[PDB]
Structure 1
């Protein structure tokens, strides 16, 4: 078995190898990459996502989210308070202000220490989940707006034709902006490109050990667990590496820098934080190997997780027993 310790693997495809996206994902999996739940892909040196970022300040962040924490430094939840609209130029100036900017630090490790010590005492503002793309239309390789759709994968593998579309999302971050522990909708893959700015640190649990994280989460967030049988789908709970280590949960960490892709694999729980002002683009995708994960994915039916139009069909075809109850939650 390849990569039996479930380490995060880093790939350096050539420009030739960067032509066929599906084929490269399958290659990475042949090397055991998926066992970690997360992989890094450094694009060939000849590739670029677009020519410059010089003209992005006029993108609107219609609903910036203030991420307010509750709990203790290593075990907390976050709620998202909606703020007034602002442009990316306005958001970048806010990220760079004295109130919100990255503190002085020695290296990524010192910054990580500061994040886990001090995150709860601040409420950074995250411009998350903005439909759109920063890839130039002429970028033909690993253009996250030109990928094969999940609906088309489901049709190729299973013969069934369904409604729905699959488009990318932009994320504008600042120091301490946080993504809570989660797997993707329907335990899909994700791919995330860091277009510009400061790094993003990731934590990940191997898919084969995801239920150990779930059991710890039920213990640490016991009222949330009684409220919903899949409350991690709410995307609000944080658990630090120190707490994970104290509880014997297998995990890994890695820092993504501008110009790099990350892939999350089906049922790979992940969480993380931004080091400073940045912009990422991410989208869900599927392969043939995902289908069985999609059939087994948990679902939030308490009604809190409230997700996309296209998830309806996935549930309806892959999980027809749950259909009914899951749609009572979503309506």
Structure 2
């Protein structure tokens, strides 16, 4: 068995290996990369996502979200308070202001210590989930707006044609902006490219151990667990590495820098935070190996998780017994 300790693997494809996206994902899996839940892909030196980032300031963040925490430093939830629209240039100036800027630090480990100690005492503002792309149309390799669609994969594997579309999303972050513990919708893969700016630190639980994280979360968030049998789908709960180690939960951590891709694998729980002003692009995707995970994915039916149009068909075809209850949650 390849990668039996479930370590995060880092890949350096050549320009020739960067041509065929599906083939390279399958290669990484042949080496055991999926067992970690997360892999890093460093593009060949010949590649670029676009020529410059000098002309992005006029992108609008229609609904910036202020991430307000409740709880204790290592075990907390966050809710998202909606703020007035602002441009990417306006948000960048805000991120760099004395109230929001990254503090002085020695290295990534010192910054990580500061994040866990102090996050709850601040409310950073995140531009999330903005439909769009920063890849140049002429970039042919690993262009997250030109991937094979999940609807086409389902149709190729299972023969059923379904409605829905699959497009990328932009994230504009600042110091302390936080992504809560989650797997993807329908336990899909994700791919995330850090276009510019400061790093993003990730934490991940191997897919084979995901239920250990779920049992800890039910213990730590007991009201939320009574409310919903899949409350991590709400994407609001944070648990620190120190608390995970205290409770014997297997995990790994890695820091992504600008110019690097991360891939999350089916049922790989992940969480993390941004170091300072940055911009990332991400999209979900599928492969043949995903289908069995899609069929077994948990679902939130309490009403909180509310998701995209295209998840309807995935539930309807892969999980027909659950469909009626899930759809009641959506309506």
With the shorter chain as reference, the TM-score category is over 0.9
Normalised by the length of structure 2, the TM-score is: 1.00
CA–CA separation in structure 2 for the residues paired with 1:228 and 1:328: 14
Q: Which residue of 2 is the match for residue 33 of structure 1?
A: 33
Deviation at 1:110, TM superposition (A): 0.1
Deviation at 1:235, TM superposition (A): 0.1
Give the corresponding residue for 2:177: 177
In 1, distance between residues paired with 2:196 and 2:121? 27
Q: Which runs of 5+ in 2 are unaligned?
A: none
* Whole-angstrom CA distance in 2 between matches of 1:200 and 1:325: 36
1:297 aligns with 2:297: yes
Shift in Å at residue 57 of structure 1? 0.2
Cα displacement string for residues 120-174 of structure 1 (whole angstroms, at most 9, x for unaligned residues)? 0000000000000000000000000000000000000000000000000000000
Q: Secondary structure at the match of 2:146?
A: coil
Cα offset for 1:269?
Answer: 0.1
Distance in 2, matches of 1:290 and 1:9, equals 20
* CA distance in 2: counterparts of 1:161 and 1:58, whole angstroms: 38
Structure 1 unmatched runs, 5+: none
Q: State the Cα deviation string for residues 189-215 of structure 1 (Å, max 9, x = none).
A: 000000000000000000000000000
Equivalent-residue separation in structure 2 for 1:296 and 1:224 (angstroms): 22
Aligned residue number for residue 195 of structure 2 = 195
* TM-superposed deviation, 1:107: 0.1
Task: Give the Cα–Cα distance (whole angstroms) in 2 for the partners of residues 192 and 173 of structure 1.
Answer: 14
CA distance in 2, matches of 1:109, 1:261: 21
Show CA shifts across 1:281-329 (max 9, x none): 0000000000000000000000000000000000000000000000000
Shift of 1:67: 0.0
State the secondary structure of the residue aligned to 1:322: helix
Q: Secondary structure at the match of 1:242?
A: helix
CA deviation profile, 1:26-52 (whole Å, cap 9, x unmatched)? 000000000000000000000000000
Please report how far the alpha carbon of residue 230 of structure 1 lies from its aligned counterpart in structure 2 after TM superposition: 0.2
Q: Quick one: distance in 1 between partners of 2:124 and 2:311? A: 29
SS of corresponding position for 1:313:
helix
Question: Structure 1 runs of 4+ off > 3 angstroms?
Answer: none
Separation of aligned partners in 1, 2:105 and 2:70 = 25
> 2:160 corresponds to which residue?
160
3-state SS in 2 of match to 1:129: strand
C-alpha distance in structure 2 between counterparts of 1:179 and 1:330, whole Å: 23
User: Deviation at 1:253?
Assistant: 0.1
